[PDB]
Scaffold this active site. Structure first.
Site, PDB file in Angstrom:
ATOM      1  N   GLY B  94       0.760  -1.133   0.116  1.00  0.00           N
ATOM      2  CA  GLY B  94       0.145   0.112   0.029  1.00  0.00           C
ATOM      3  C   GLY B  94       0.928   1.304  -0.137  1.00  0.00           C
ATOM      4  O   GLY B  94       1.930   1.254  -0.402  1.00  0.00           O
ATOM      5  N   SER B 126       6.091  -5.268  -0.933  1.00  0.00           N
ATOM      6  CA  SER B 126       6.259  -3.633  -1.411  1.00  0.00           C
ATOM      7  C   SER B 126       6.371  -2.863  -0.135  1.00  0.00           C
ATOM      8  O   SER B 126       7.317  -2.962   0.156  1.00  0.00           O
ATOM      9  CB  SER B 126       4.823  -3.461  -2.081  1.00  0.00           C
ATOM     10  N   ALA B 127       5.425  -2.212   0.193  1.00  0.00           N
ATOM     11  CA  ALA B 127       5.565  -1.167   1.204  1.00  0.00           C
ATOM     12  C   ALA B 127       5.974  -2.302   2.772  1.00  0.00           C
ATOM     13  O   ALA B 127       6.675  -1.683   3.238  1.00  0.00           O
ATOM     14  CB  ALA B 127       4.130  -0.711   1.703  1.00  0.00           C
ATOM     15  N   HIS B 163       9.463  -2.779  -6.733  1.00  0.00           N
ATOM     16  CA  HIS B 163       8.838  -2.527  -8.165  1.00  0.00           C
ATOM     17  C   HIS B 163       9.826  -2.072  -8.972  1.00  0.00           C
ATOM     18  O   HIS B 163       9.516  -1.198  -9.782  1.00  0.00           O
ATOM     19  CB  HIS B 163       7.495  -1.545  -8.042  1.00  0.00           C
ATOM     20  N   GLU B 198       9.712  -6.441 -10.038  1.00  0.00           N
ATOM     21  CA  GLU B 198       8.408  -7.424  -9.760  1.00  0.00           C
ATOM     22  C   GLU B 198       8.989  -8.778 -10.017  1.00  0.00           C
ATOM     23  O   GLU B 198       9.718  -9.090 -10.940  1.00  0.00           O
ATOM     24  CB  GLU B 198       7.516  -6.551 -10.455  1.00  0.00           C
TER      25      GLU B 198
HETATM   26  N1  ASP Z   1       3.520   1.131  -2.953  1.00  0.00           N
HETATM   27  C1  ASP Z   1       4.259   0.006  -3.379  1.00  0.00           C
HETATM   28  C2  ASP Z   1       5.616   0.061  -2.476  1.00  0.00           C
HETATM   29  C3  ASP Z   1       6.722   0.940  -3.180  1.00  0.00           C
HETATM   30  O1  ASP Z   1       6.797   0.781  -4.515  1.00  0.00           O
HETATM   31  O2  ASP Z   1       7.516   1.592  -2.699  1.00  0.00           O
HETATM   32  C4  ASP Z   1       3.365  -1.299  -2.797  1.00  0.00           C
HETATM   33  O3  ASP Z   1       3.341  -1.430  -1.809  1.00  0.00           O
HETATM   34  O4  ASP Z   1       2.960  -1.830  -3.691  1.00  0.00           O
END
Ligand code: ASP
Ligand code: ASP
Lengths: 230, 235
Positions: B94, B126-127, B163, B198
């Protein structure tokens, strides 16, 4: 009552750096010549080099550029400046240096008292109430996201919703929609490359050949074109 | 050249592969690292556009077939006691700024880090991968809320840029990802930034941080050309 030129980006494809800004600046100078340059967004080149580059491109317009990092008294330099120019780069470093040096309030007050403000990219971000719509990486902590508050709406510069083939990361609109969840009162202007907003003589005028997109909470994106008055 | 890493981490670049279900590629990695663990607490605060309840239920559903029981930290009576008793800490993707802000405001940062240092398995995508690093300075996210500091869990010593891709839309004049990373290396020349594409992940297990995933990973250090790495690399 403010005079602002807020550019999305510095360079059009196949054109010189700031070439497209020169006629806009020339038409808005209104006799102003004395400018202070705020170089703090620059990371990969020295602030001296950044200042010298800005002085060179603006010299044919009759503008004299002084780098704020080189003057003994930056507060007096801002006070006496007719033009405040804020270059692109990393928005977090720009805000952090501006705040740490105590320049935020003086710059905003100087502009509110009639100085012309020119900013591109990161410099456009800084003119807004906060930097919450920058696309930049948080490489330094600016100790707050509040900015100059010279322009009431949030600008997202370099706007494009395109992604590399097969990318699963957030789209730009998705990132903006998240801001509209946490700050539902905001208007976000997706200002594409090649475009600008010129605030002069009581009007905020959209400029540039590409489509601009406005995002508000719960509303479909609205397309705008050059000549729109905010 | 990392020394022995004593935490058990699964750090995913992203949730969903092309043509796969959400977290489908993570399930075998999680299952093979559980090591008998079953009790998980989910940290949902990165989620913005869906409720944390919906996010938790989605995570609970996808992980139930692995035998993992998920409880959302936002709805437990005692979040400190929940983290202390958890075997697994799961941090979803997120907005990284909101994730860090809520975690700090709720006083969960140190308890989460201490619990993992005491043997709990940490899963983040991710986050959630950003949050495991010393800071969030390599997130790609928009600063929609102020987290009151960029320091994070410090469970993984290097900076992950998730990513990762250096591609830009046709004709875009904005910074490339590598250019953004190179600016960080100016202000923080001691850092190592891992451009984790990814489909890839970093699994820290049995003292080793191991790169995983089919795509090429790029490492950035100040003044050095980007280094290409592939699955099996030990950091
Ligand atoms: N916003 C991305 C995290 C990032 O690219 O820094 C995610 O949680 O999917
Ligand atoms: N880093 C950009 C500004 C932005 O995209 O937020 C620039 O100054 O060119």
């Amino acid at each position: 009552g403010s005079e602002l030129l807020l550019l999305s980006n510095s360079t059009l494809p196949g054109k010189a750096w700031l070439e497209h800004a020169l006629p806009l600046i020339a038409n808005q100078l209104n006799g102003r010549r004395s400018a202070v340059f705020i170089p703090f967004a620059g990371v990969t080149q020295t602030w001296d080099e950044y200042t010298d580059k800005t002085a060179e491109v603006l010299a044919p317009l009759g503008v004299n550029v002084t780098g704020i990092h080189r003057v003994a008294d930056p507060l007096a330099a801002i006070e006496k400046a007719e033009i405040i120019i804020v270059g692109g780069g990393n928005t977090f470093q720009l805000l952090k240096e501006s705040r740490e040096r105590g320049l935020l309030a003086p710059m905003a007050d100087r502009v509110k008292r009639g100085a012309l403000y020119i900013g591109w990219s990161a410099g456009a971000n800084l003119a807004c109430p906060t930097i919450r719509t920058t696309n930049d990486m948080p490489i330094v902590d600016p100790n707050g996201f509040d900015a100059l508050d010279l322009f009431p709406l949030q600008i997202n510069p370099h706007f494009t919703n395109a992604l590399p083939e097969g990318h699963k990361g957030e789209t730009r609109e998705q990132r903006i929609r998240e801001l509209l969840v946490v700050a539902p009162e905001l208007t976000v202007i997706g200002l594409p490359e090649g475009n600008w907003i010129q605030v002069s003589n009581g009007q905020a005028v959209l400029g540039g050949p590409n489509t601009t997109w406005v995002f508000k909470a719960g509303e479909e994106a609205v397309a705008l074109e050059a000549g729109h008055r905010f």
